[PDB]
Amino acid sequence: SVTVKRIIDNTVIVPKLPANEDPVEYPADYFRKSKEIPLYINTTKSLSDLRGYVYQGLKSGNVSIIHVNSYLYGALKDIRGKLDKDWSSFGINIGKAGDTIGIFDLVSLKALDGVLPDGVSDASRTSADDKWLPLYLLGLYRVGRTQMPEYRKKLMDGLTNQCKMINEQFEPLVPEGRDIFDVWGNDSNYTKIVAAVDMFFHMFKKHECASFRYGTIVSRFKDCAALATFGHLCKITGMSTEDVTTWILNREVADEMVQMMLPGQEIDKADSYMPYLIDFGLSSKSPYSSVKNPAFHFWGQLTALLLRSTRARNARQPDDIEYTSLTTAGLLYAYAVGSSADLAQQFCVGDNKYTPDTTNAPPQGRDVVEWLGWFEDQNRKPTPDMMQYAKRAVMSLQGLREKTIGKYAKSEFDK
Amino acid sequence: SVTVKRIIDNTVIVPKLPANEDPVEYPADYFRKSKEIPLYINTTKSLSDLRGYVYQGLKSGNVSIIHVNSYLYGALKDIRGKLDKDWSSFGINIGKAGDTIGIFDLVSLKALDGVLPDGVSDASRTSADDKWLPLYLLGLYRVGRTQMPEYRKKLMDGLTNQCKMINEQFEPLVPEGRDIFDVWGNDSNYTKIVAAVDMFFHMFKKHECASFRYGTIVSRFKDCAALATFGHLCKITGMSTEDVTTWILNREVADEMVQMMLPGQEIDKADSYMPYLIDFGLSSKSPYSSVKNPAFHFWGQLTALLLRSTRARNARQPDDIEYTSLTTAGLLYAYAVGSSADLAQQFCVGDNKYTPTNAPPQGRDVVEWLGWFEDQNRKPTPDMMQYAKRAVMSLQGLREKTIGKYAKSEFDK
Amino acid sequence: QPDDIEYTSLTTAGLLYAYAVGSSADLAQQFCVGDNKYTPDLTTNAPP
d(CA A64, CA A116): 8
β partners of residue A81? A101
Tell me the binding residues of A for RNA.
142, 151, 205, 213, 285, 316, 401
DSSP state of B402: B
- The radius of gyration of chain C from alpha carbons, rounded to an integer in Å, stands at 18
Among B131, B154, B236, B308, most A C-beta atoms within 10 A, so best to mutate, is B308
Nearest CB to B249; choose among C22, C29, C42: C29
**Torsion over CA: A195, A196, A200, A201 (sign):** negative
Other Cβ atoms less than 10 A from the Cβ of B51: the count is 23
d(CA C39, CA C35): 12
d(CA A137, CA A212): 10
Q: What is the dihedral of CA C1, C7, C10, C16, to 10 degrees?
A: 100
* Cβ contact, residue pair C37, B366, below 8 Å: yes
Residue at which a domain ends, from B183, B218, B253: B218
CB B291 within 8 A of CB B48: no
State the number of CA atoms in the 13 A half-sphere of A313 facing the CB: 13
Q: Which chains touch B (3 or more CB pairs under 8 A)?
A: A, C
Q: What is the dihedral of CA B187, B189, B190, B196, to 10 degrees?
A: 150
d(CA A312, CA A229): 9
d(CA A193, CA A39): 8
d(CA A212, CA A161): 9
List the one residue out of A277, A197, A263, A200 whose CA is nearest residue A30.
Answer: A277
- The radius of gyration of chain A from alpha carbons, rounded to an integer in Å, stands at 27
Element (H or E) spanning B100, and its range? strand B100-101
d(CA C17, CA C9): 12
d(CA B200, CA A379): 53
d(CA A240, CA A218): 27
Other Cβ atoms less than 10 A from the Cβ of B80: the count is 16
Element (H or E) spanning A324, and its range? helix A323-339
- For helices A251-261 and A294-306, angle between their N-to-C axes, nearest 10 degrees: 110
d(CA A251, CA B78): 44
Neighboring chain B residues of A177 at a CB cutoff of 8 Å: 156, 160
Say yes or no: B275 contacts chain A, CB-CB below 8 A: yes
Three-point CA angle B381, B383, B385, nearest 5°? 75
- A270 and A402 housed in the same domain: yes
Give how far Cα B85 sits from Cα of A97, A313, B101, B199, B387, Å.
47, 47, 12, 16, 51
d(CA A152, CA A157): 8
CB A147 within 8 A of CB A223: no
List the one residue out of A189, A181, A50 whose CA is nearest residue A120.
Answer: A50
DSSP state of A316: B
Residue B387 domain-assigned (yes or no): yes
List the one residue out of A361, A403, A249 whose CA is nearest residue B314.
Answer: A403
Give how far Cα A285 sits from Cα of A224, A289, A293, B206, B278, Å.
10, 8, 12, 11, 30
- Longest pairwise C-alpha distance within chain C: 58
CB A247 within 8 A of CB A257: no
Q: What is the CATH number of the domain that holds B45?
A: 1.10.3570.10
Going along A134-270, which residue ranges are E strands? none
Other Cβ atoms less than 10 A from the Cβ of B273: the count is 24
- For helices B65-75 and B188-203, angle between their N-to-C axes, nearest 10 degrees: 30
What's the per-residue H, E or C state across chain C? CCCCCCHHHHHHHHHHHHHHHHHCCCCCCCEECCCCCCCCCCCCCCCC
List the one residue out of A220, A390, A230, A221 whose CA is nearest residue A297.
Answer: A230
- A315 and A366 housed in the same domain: yes
- B332 and B360 housed in the same domain: yes
The alpha-carbon gap from A2 to the nearest alpha carbon of chain C, in Å, equals 7
d(CA B28, CA B335): 39
CB B258 within 8 A of CB A4: no
**Torsion over CA: A214, A216, A221, A223 (sign):** positive
CB A312 within 8 A of CB A405: yes
CA B8 to chain centre: 53
In total, chain A counts a number of residues equal to 415
* Cβ contact, residue pair C21, B371, below 8 Å: no
d(CA A29, CA A283): 9
**Solving technique:** X-ray
d(CA A15, CA B241): 6
Neighboring chain B residues of A373 at a CB cutoff of 8 Å: 353
d(CA B281, CA A62): 43
CB proximity list for B327: less than 8 A, separation 6 or greater: B298, B302, B410
State the number of CA atoms in the 13 A half-sphere of A272 facing the CB: 18
Element (H or E) spanning A12, and its range? strand A11-13
Residue at which a domain ends, from B187, B218, B249: B218
- B259 and B385 housed in the same domain: yes
- B207 and B225 housed in the same domain: no
Other Cβ atoms less than 10 A from the Cβ of B57: the count is 21
d(CA B267, CA B290): 16
Please tell me whether residue A332 adopts helix, strand or coil conformation: helix
H and E: helices and strands count for chain B: 16, 8
DSSP, residue by residue, B312-379: GGG-B--SSS-HHHHHHHHHHHHHHHHHS--------SS--------SPPSS--HHHHHHHHHHTTSS
Other Cβ atoms less than 10 A from the Cβ of B26: the count is 22
* Cβ contact, residue pair A7, C36, below 8 Å: yes
Give how far Cα B350 sits from Cα of A369, A374, B37, Å.
11, 19, 61
DSSP, residue by residue, B217-264: GGGTTTT--HHHHHHHHHHHHT--HHHHHHT--SHHHHHHHHHHH-SS
CB B229 within 8 A of CB B294: no
d(CA B220, CA B273): 9
d(CA B218, CA B275): 10
Other Cβ atoms less than 10 A from the Cβ of C6: the count is 8
Closest chain B residue to C39 measured between Cα atoms?
Answer: B371
Residue B322 domain-assigned (yes or no): yes
Please tell me whether residue A138 adopts helix, strand or coil conformation: helix
Say yes or no: B301 contacts chain A, CB-CB below 8 A: no
Q: Which chains touch A (3 or more CB pairs under 8 A)?
A: B, C
Residue at which a domain ends, from A218, A235, A266: A218
B394 residue type, one letter: S
Say yes or no: B381 contacts chain C, CB-CB below 8 A: no
**Torsion over CA: B106, B112, B113, B115 (sign):** negative
Say yes or no: A360 contacts chain B, CB-CB below 8 A: no
CA B341 to chain centre: 31
Element (H or E) spanning B155, and its range? helix B151-157
CB proximity list for B356: less than 8 A, separation 6 or greater: none
Gaps after residue numbers in chain C (C–N over 2.5 angstroms): 41
CB A70 within 8 A of CB A133: no
- A212 and A225 housed in the same domain: no
In total, chain B counts a number of residues equal to 413
β partners of residue A312? none
Other Cβ atoms less than 10 A from the Cβ of B136: the count is 19
* Cβ contact, residue pair C33, A4, below 8 Å: yes
d(CA A242, CA A226): 16
Neighboring chain A residues of B257 at a CB cutoff of 8 Å: 13, 15
Q: What is the dihedral of CA A261, A267, A269, A270, to 10 degrees?
A: -140
Q: What separation, in Å, do the N-terminal and C-terminal C-alpha atoms of chain C show?
A: 31
d(CA B303, CA C15): 28
CB proximity list for A128: less than 8 A, separation 6 or greater: A166
Phi, psi of B5 (to 5 degrees): -110, 160
Three-point CA angle A368, A371, A374, nearest 5°? 155
Q: What is the CATH number of the domain that holds B379?
A: 1.10.3610.10
Long-range residue pairs from B85-89, CB within 8 A, at least 24 positions apart, any chain: B87/B203, B87/B271, B89/B266, B89/B269, B89/B271, B89/B272, B89/B273, B89/B274
List the one residue out of A407, A374, A414 whose CA is nearest residue A393.
Answer: A414
Structural domain including A331 reads 221-414
DSSP state of B197: H
d(CA A190, CA A184): 7
- A196 and A236 housed in the same domain: no
CB B407 within 8 A of CB B392: yes
Residue A300 domain-assigned (yes or no): yes
Q: Which chains touch C (3 or more CB pairs under 8 A)?
A: A, B
Say yes or no: B398 contacts chain A, CB-CB below 8 A: no
Please tell me whether residue A4 adopts helix, strand or coil conformation: strand
Residue A27 domain-assigned (yes or no): no
Please tell me whether residue B88 adopts helix, strand or coil conformation: strand
Please tell me whether residue A223 adopts helix, strand or coil conformation: coil
Please tell me whether residue B148 adopts helix, strand or coil conformation: coil
CB proximity list for A318: less than 8 A, separation 6 or greater: A290, A291, A294, A295, A297, A298
CB A81 within 8 A of CB A204: yes
d(CA B324, CA C23): 9
Tell me the binding residues of B for RNA.
142, 151, 205, 213, 285, 316, 399
d(CA B408, CA B396): 9
The alpha-carbon gap from B334 to the nearest alpha carbon of chain A, in Å, equals 10
Burial class (CB in 10 A: 0-12, 13-18, 19+), B296: buried
Q: What is the number of domains present in chain B?
A: 2
- B227 and B122 housed in the same domain: no
Burial class (CB in 10 A: 0-12, 13-18, 19+), B91: exposed
CB A144 within 8 A of CB A185: yes
DSSP state of B316: B
Going along A119-222, which residue ranges are E strands? none
Please tell me whether residue A404 adopts helix, strand or coil conformation: strand
Neighboring chain B residues of C17 at a CB cutoff of 8 Å: none
CA B216 to chain centre: 13
List the one residue out of B312, B317, B257 whose CA is nearest residue B287.
Answer: B257
State the number of CA atoms in the 13 A half-sphere of B233 facing the CB: 29
Say yes or no: A272 contacts chain B, CB-CB below 8 A: no
- A180 and A247 housed in the same domain: no
CB B167 within 8 A of CB B182: no
Please tell me whether residue B12 adopts helix, strand or coil conformation: strand
- A193 and A227 housed in the same domain: no
CB B303 within 8 A of CB B333: yes
d(CA A104, CA A108): 7
CB proximity list for B120: less than 8 A, separation 6 or greater: B48, B49, B52
b/e map of B216-240 (b: 16 or more CB within 10 Å)? bbbbbbbbbbbbbbbbbbbbbbbbe
- B239 and B381 housed in the same domain: yes
Three-point CA angle A217, A184, A157, nearest 5°? 45
Other Cβ atoms less than 10 A from the Cβ of A380: the count is 18
List the one residue out of B150, B153, B127 whose CA is nearest residue B71.
Answer: B127
Closest chain C residue to B328 measured between Cα atoms?
Answer: C25
d(CA A46, CA A129): 14
CB A252 within 8 A of CB A321: yes
Say yes or no: A7 contacts chain C, CB-CB below 8 A: yes
Please tell me whether residue B388 adopts helix, strand or coil conformation: helix
- The radius of gyration of chain B from alpha carbons, rounded to an integer in Å, stands at 27
* Cβ contact, residue pair A4, C29, below 8 Å: no
β partners of residue B12? B5
CB B203 within 8 A of CB B103: no
B121 residue type, one letter: S
CB A289 within 8 A of CB A392: no
Q: Using DSSP bridges, classify how beta strands B100-101 and B81-82 pair: parallel, antiparallel or unpaired.
A: antiparallel
d(CA B125, CA A204): 49
CB A109 within 8 A of CB A44: no
CB proximity list for B183: less than 8 A, separation 6 or greater: B65
CB proximity list for B112: less than 8 A, separation 6 or greater: B42
Three-point CA angle A54, A59, A64, nearest 5°? 40
CB proximity list for B30: less than 8 A, separation 6 or greater: B282, B283
Among B157, B296, B343, B367, most A C-beta atoms within 10 A, so best to mutate, is B343
Closest chain C residue to A3 measured between Cα atoms?
Answer: C33
Phi, psi of B198 (to 5 degrees): -60, -50
d(CA A146, CA A177): 8
Residue A64 domain-assigned (yes or no): yes
- B225 and B168 housed in the same domain: no
List the one residue out of A217, A70, A75 whose CA is nearest residue A143.
Answer: A217
Residue A25 domain-assigned (yes or no): no
CB proximity list for A273: less than 8 A, separation 6 or greater: A27, A37, A89, A90, A92, A199, A266, A280, A282
Going along A28-149, which residue ranges are E strands? 39-40, 81-82, 87-89, 92-95, 100-101, 108-109
